[PDB]
Amino acid sequence: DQGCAINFGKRELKCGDGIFIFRDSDDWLNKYSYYPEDPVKLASIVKASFEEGKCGLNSVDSLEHEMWRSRADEINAIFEENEVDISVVVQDPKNVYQRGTHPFSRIRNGSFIIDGKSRKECPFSNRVWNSFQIEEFGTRVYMDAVFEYTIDCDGSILGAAVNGKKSAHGSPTFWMGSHEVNGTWMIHTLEALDYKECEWPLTHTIGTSVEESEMFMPRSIGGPVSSHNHIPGYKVQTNGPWMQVPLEVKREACPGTSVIIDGNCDGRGKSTRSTTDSGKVIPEWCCRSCTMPPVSFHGSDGCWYPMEIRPRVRSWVT
Amino acid sequence: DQGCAINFGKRELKCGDGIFIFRDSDDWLNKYSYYPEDPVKLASIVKASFEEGKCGLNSVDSLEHEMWRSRADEINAIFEENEVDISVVVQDPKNVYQRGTHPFSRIRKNGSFIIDGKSRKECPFSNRVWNSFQIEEFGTGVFTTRVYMDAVFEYTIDCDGSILGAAVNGKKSAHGSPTFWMGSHEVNGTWMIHTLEALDYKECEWPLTHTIGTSVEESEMFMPRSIGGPVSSHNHIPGYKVQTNGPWMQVPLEVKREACPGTSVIIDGNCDGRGKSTRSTTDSGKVIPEWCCRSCTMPPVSFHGSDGCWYPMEIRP
Amino acid sequence: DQGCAINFGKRELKCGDGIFIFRDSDDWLNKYSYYPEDPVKLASIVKASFEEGKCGLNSVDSLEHEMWRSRADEINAIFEENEVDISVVVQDPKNVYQRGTHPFSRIRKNGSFIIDGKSRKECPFSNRVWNSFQIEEFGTRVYMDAVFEYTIDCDGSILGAAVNGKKSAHGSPTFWMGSHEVNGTWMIHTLEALDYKECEWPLTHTIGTSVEESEMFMPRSIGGPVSSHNHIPGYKVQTNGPWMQVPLEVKREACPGTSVIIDGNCDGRGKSTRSTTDSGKVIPEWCCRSCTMPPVSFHGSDGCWYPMEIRPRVRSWVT
Amino acid sequence: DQGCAINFGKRELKCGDGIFIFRDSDKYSYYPEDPVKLASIVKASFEEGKCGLNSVDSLEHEMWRSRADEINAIFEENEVDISVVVQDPKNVYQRGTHPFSRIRKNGSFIIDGKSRKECPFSNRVWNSFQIEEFGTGVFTTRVYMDAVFEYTIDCDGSILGAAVNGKKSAHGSPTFWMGSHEVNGTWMIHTLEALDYKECEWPLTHTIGTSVEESEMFMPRSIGGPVSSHNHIPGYKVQTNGPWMQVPLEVKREACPGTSVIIDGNCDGRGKSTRSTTDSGKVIPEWCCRSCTMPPVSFHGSDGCWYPMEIRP
């Protein structure tokens, strides 16, 4: 990794050798195509899995779903010669990639559904979720079908960095920037193009010296557990708007709403969308310990105030 | 943060945004003009500290030494202009620093105040100040790097985080420092050190908030925490246990995973081990072909210290 | 100038301070906002120059034409408020800025100061100001000060040149020429021209000025550097070249529909001829006298044009 | 080619293609032909009646100093009595007469030593090396040199550089940097540093504008300096007898301590350069010049101030 870097704040121009981390969480992953190793071998594994009765594989990353989208036309016509007749149909869940609990099985009008909905035939469970791994540098072919059921994200594409008082928790579809002010550490950026559920591996987190009930992004949704994951006056956002499209976290009150500090709110509560079902705006909002600048999101339906901003549509993560 | 990397040959140039930490910043040892707060208030603070019975000071980095070396003239000038008897003398320890006990004291013939050097029998290191400096900013020069420093009125055993750095990538990680660089990679399992340059013997503990991953205990860490080293799973080499007693108090080290000329590479499962870190050579500077290592790895680890090759506690005669 | 640079052949990553020349020969000239010296004064200058009796003002660079097209409205407002009644309208030549021979005049039925006017019969290319303008600094992004000094050489505040071993680059906002040295001699491997100027390269911005004419590839008149780096073996000067076209480019490759066979029975030098005839057919038969084995060809508006040395066994009238 | 500058404070960049030259790139590891063929060439040169060599630049001398021991070892292995020694001229390298010859009782082949009456420079080899490759490798800019058997009095053109811009220019080299700018008409030098003393002429194909006559060039031609209109300071003619034989120089536009210069139309001029002080370390504040400028120029070399030929005490 030979290169240069410029920091206009610190006006430094060091070059040479080292370690660099990038911010490729935006629309830049479509540049390089994804070629799984030995597509012929994958057909045998798919055929073996169908024997038990597994409904299908629900992907965990947008890259995984794009791999299936690209290979749908390239693998469906392959096994036609072998006369196996296992049709592959790819559904389109937008960004609500959920967790399944099953690994692959060993080699010993049917349709192999992928990302099937909550149909009565079988639930989200009884499906393969995260039984895959990258070979290297995730030209090259980088895919591996392993039988190791793990409840974390794959660590060959992730990253993290600290450069003094800065911070960064990089990921292909996730990014969290942190900085230190007045001693404690705070969050000032957070984006997520999807809704994963693999927990951040402990080998890529910075400063594991915190417990639960004090972070901002819970570890279930795929948030790092670190001292750099915290905002003053806010606890873990269990009932937050984490089931949405590409998000963003802003430290500002929303256009039409306002927050009035009080002391008779209903504890934690649950988050509420800015626009209620009744169509009437409610400027009455109360807070207990949060700072007077509220936190604002930017996703599918717009503003979703956190749990602590109570009035006087709801998150369904659990 | 608006930088990027290059790859000669394949002709790849991917540019974007992120966080960058470099290794060649550990090459320009003497390129910084350290600036304290001011000649006046610092002299007043050290005079106040000496007022309540303090022998002297003790440098914590290889930067504070040059700061005092460059500002001793101004300190003496302030002492002369203040008509004060106190004076400071700066000796030259090679690279070894030890632990003090007190910070700069509270505000409200020739004097002696040893900034750093051989500790006389007058008093132990207890009657000294060790860690009272905080870096608020790193560099404001257009291309060069001038360092400003702050005053701290409390005793903290941790280093200062304004100069550190630690980044991880795909099967790679590094913990940077102006006088230290640890490089790791993961092959067939866990992580392991493949490059480790140490240039001084500090004694400030690496902050807990700059360690990439705390899934490790104080049982199998190569560089000890007290010597100054990250408490992270990236800071170890398989087959070699904690180096609680090693050649960390020497000239710039270059830990290498190879043997040394004139030596023997044999692994013995019964020879004595886990004692001290004895010198590889003898008084005459000649090789001894009797080295043994315990449960180890085939490529031995050899230090490059003052006298040349050194061996860890896993290798004994 | 502080910065960093790379070299894919030398494998360098040096940084520091020095001199930098860039390849901003793209459509970056439209980003600069041209602010002449006190547009109120420019009205008086134009009024004077008109009173002494000069037809128009054929700009030399695309920057000047863009400046005039942008500031015609403001100058119109100025001499409409001040009651001067000398109408100024900006016409549009494609890229064929020619040479006029007059500097501005000294200070002290509608008037028509046509800018970049076509060669009409009302008055010739004379009575036209050509190059009485001078960039000030930092080539308001870019200023401009009027002068009264007739000049043939280009304006030196925007040009550039650099040699870094065996490489070369004669830069300009609307020009580029990347030279290289192989087997001792120097050649040309890149050439672009977004327009057709006629200001000569100044002798203070040419590298290795030690050669005469009859050995160049782009003559001085078209605005070509006078240097040993401006030369291709087997070709003399391109006096009768296709230099009156749109953005050009020189290629060391025969055009797809044609090929050239080395021979010794051609019809002298003559003049350049397009590959395609008037009727739309392509001529596949070409010959040569002393040119090198790989033929050269341009790519402008009408398409491929071969140099003077290639003949077939109303066109470009540069002369 | 894909590099760019910076605009600190304005926080903007202009990154693209072009040509870049630099000053403070400042290590080096020169590699000759090979330990064998070079040994054969120098052996043949000794056989044909050449006393020794003569280094031309601080690169060739360093290469010889580094590789003389290996050359002697190859000589011992091949059983030849020739031995080479690398004396140390301070920073002065002078001219030879002959190039290397084609391939096919302790003898002495001094690399660059004294001018003893043993033999003059006539029987010496001066410039017979060409740098085929430059830079590369791990930021060491390794340099590979190929023997050349023809006599030329021009420097090696693969390590030079010369750029011009809007009212700025610079002639570059690993041991030379002339910086010119244009103010109120003509060009003038505003920075000049020479870390060596060579006698190779600047190549004619790397001079930015040769509209100059060889009578108004500040740095002369034989000493090694660009032949260009950018190479002069107004009011000063050619310094043929200058303080050029020193360690790293710095042409500065200022007076000297304890000395003052007054333009006098009576005293003579155009002589030889003399130090501002004397052999006893005493300054002489009686300096006069003919046509000069208000700020005097002074070379800062080994001995400190030196005044050009237009200033006499």
Whether D205 sits inside 8 A of C204 (CB atoms) is no
Residue B202 forms part of a structural domain = no
Which of C8, C12, C13 has the most A C-beta neighbours within 10 Å, making it the best mutation to test the interface with A? C13
Residue C11 forms part of a structural domain = no
Residue with tokens 């029998």: B121
**Cα gap B101→B58, rounded to integer Å:** 10
* Residue C102, φ and ψ in degrees, nearest 5: -165, 135
Question: Sign of the C-alpha dihedral, residues A57, A62, A67, A69?
Answer: positive
CA distance A140 to chain B (A): 13
**Cα gap C277→C288, rounded to integer Å:** 19
Give the strand pairing for D261-263 and D287-289: parallel
Residue B128 forms part of a structural domain = yes
Chain D: residues touching B (Cβ < 8 Å): 2, 8, 13
**Cα gap A86→A109, rounded to integer Å:** 8
Residue C41 forms part of a structural domain = yes
Whether A137 sits inside 8 A of B170 (CB atoms) is yes
Query: For residue C22, which residues of chain D lie inside 8 Å, CB to CB?
Result: 4, 14, 16-18
Query: For residue C6, which residues of chain B lie inside 8 Å, CB to CB?
Result: 6
Q: How far is CA B178 from CA B26, B30, B132, B217, in A?
A: 5, 10, 19, 26
Beta-carbon contacts of B303 under 8 Å, excluding residues fewer than 6 positions away, are B246, B247, B250, B253, B254, B255, B309, B310, B311, B312
Tokens of B46: 């050290």
Beta strand spans in A37-184 (E): 87-90, 111-114, 160-162, 169-171, 174-180
CA distance A105 to chain B (A): 24
Last residue of a domain, one of D177, D209, D238: D238
Nearest residue of C to residue D157, measured between CA atoms: C165
Burial string for A251-278 (b: 16+ CB within 10 Å, else e) reads eebbeebebeeeeebeeebebbbbbeee
Residue with tokens 């078209």: C222
- Which three-class secondary structure state does DSSP give residue B193? strand
Question: Sign of the C-alpha dihedral, residues B266, B272, B278, B282?
Answer: negative
CA distance A312 to chain C (A): 54
Burial string for D193-221 (b: 16+ CB within 10 Å, else e) reads ebebbbbbbbbebbbbbbebeeeebbbbe
Cα B125 versus chain centre, distance: 19
Return the DSSP state at A39.
H
The answer to whether residues D183 and D261 belong to one domain is no
Residue B302 forms part of a structural domain = no
Tokens of C148: 């009264």
Query: Any idea what the Cα angle at residue B235 is, between residues B232 and B238, rounded to 5°?
Result: 120
**Cα gap C136→C132, rounded to integer Å:** 13
Give which of B45, B87, B36 is closest to B66, Cα–Cα.
B36
Residue D309 forms part of a structural domain = yes
Last residue of a domain, one of D126, D147, D168: D147
**Cα gap A244→A97, rounded to integer Å:** 11
The β-bridge partners of B5 are A3, B14
Return the DSSP state at A80.
T
B8, B142, B143: residue with CB nearest C8: B8
Whether C208 sits inside 8 A of D211 (CB atoms) is no
Whether B170 sits inside 8 A of A185 (CB atoms) is no
The answer to whether residues D94 and D130 belong to one domain is yes
- Which three-class secondary structure state does DSSP give residue A67? helix
Query: For residue B143, which residues of chain A lie inside 8 Å, CB to CB?
Result: 13
Give which of A296, B311, B281, D182 is closest to C134, Cα–Cα.
D182
Distance separating the N- and C-terminal Cα atoms of chain B: 51
Whether D6 sits inside 8 A of A13 (CB atoms) is yes
Tokens of C248: 């050009």
CA distance D265 to chain B (A): 46
Beta-carbon contacts of A61 under 8 Å, excluding residues fewer than 6 positions away, are A97, A172, A173, A194, A196
H/E run at residue C81: helix C62-81
Contacts of range C25-31, beta carbons closer than 8 Å, 24 or more positions apart: C25/C171, C25/C172, C25/C173, C25/C174, C25/C175, C25/C176, C25/C192, C25/C194, C28/C173, C29/C62, C29/C63, C29/C66, C29/C173, C29/C174, C30/C66, C31/C141
Residue A156 forms part of a structural domain = no
Whether B142 sits inside 8 A of C2 (CB atoms) is yes
Contact criterion met (CB below 8 Å) for D283 and D239: no
Tokens of A74: 């390239």
Query: For residue A8, which residues of chain D lie inside 8 Å, CB to CB?
Result: 8, 11
H/E run at residue C18: strand C15-22
Widest CA span in chain A? 71
Query: Any idea what the Cα angle at residue A53 is, between residues A51 and A58, rounded to 5°?
Result: 115
Rounded to a whole number of angstroms, the CA Rg of chain A reads 22
**Cα gap B20→A11, rounded to integer Å:** 14
CA distance D8 to chain A (A): 7
Tokens of C299: 């790519």
The answer to whether residues D106 and D173 belong to one domain is no
Return the DSSP state at C88.
-
Give CA torsion, residues B276, B280, B281, B287, to 10 deg. 140
Contact criterion met (CB below 8 Å) for B197 and B250: no
The total of structural domains in chain D comes to: 3
Return the DSSP state at B67.
H
D16, D24, D208: residue with CB nearest C23: D16
Give which of D198, D154, D207 is closest to D180, Cα–Cα.
D207
Number of separate helices (H) and strands (E) present in chain C: 2, 17
Domain containing D208: what range?
153-238
- Which three-class secondary structure state does DSSP give residue A173? coil
**Cα gap B49→B111, rounded to integer Å:** 13
The answer to whether residues D49 and D138 belong to one domain is yes
Beta-carbon contacts of D158 under 8 Å, excluding residues fewer than 6 positions away, are C165, C166, D130, D131, D132, D134
**Cα gap D80→A142, rounded to integer Å:** 60
Beta strand spans in C23-89 (E): 34-36, 56-57, 86-87
* Three-state SS annotation for chain D: CCCEEECCCCCCEEECCEEEEECCCCCCCEECCCCCHHHHHHHHHHHCCCCEECCCCCCHHHHHHHHHHHHHHHHHHHCCCCCEECCCCCCCCCCCCECCCCCCCCCCEECCCCCCCCCCHHHEECCCEEEEEEECCCCCCEEEEEECCCCCCECCCCCCEEEEECCEEEEEECCEEEEEEECCCCEEEEEEEECCCCCCECCHHHCECCCCCCCCCCCCCCCCCCCCCCCCCCCCCCCCCCCCCCCCCCEEECCCCCCCEEECCCCCCCCCCCECCCCCCCCCCCEEECCCCCCCEEEECCCCEECCCCEEC
Residue with tokens 């009008």: A109
The β-bridge partners of C276 are C282
The answer to whether residues D210 and D282 belong to one domain is no
CA distance C25 to chain D (A): 10
The β-bridge partners of B167 are A161, B174
The answer to whether residues D34 and D143 belong to one domain is yes
Whether B6 sits inside 8 A of C16 (CB atoms) is no
Tokens of B294: 């315990």
**Cα gap D167→A250, rounded to integer Å:** 48
The answer to whether residues D122 and D224 belong to one domain is no
Residue A49 forms part of a structural domain = yes
For chains A and C, count residue pairs whose Cβ atoms are closer than 8 Å.
11
**Cα gap A8→D12, rounded to integer Å:** 10
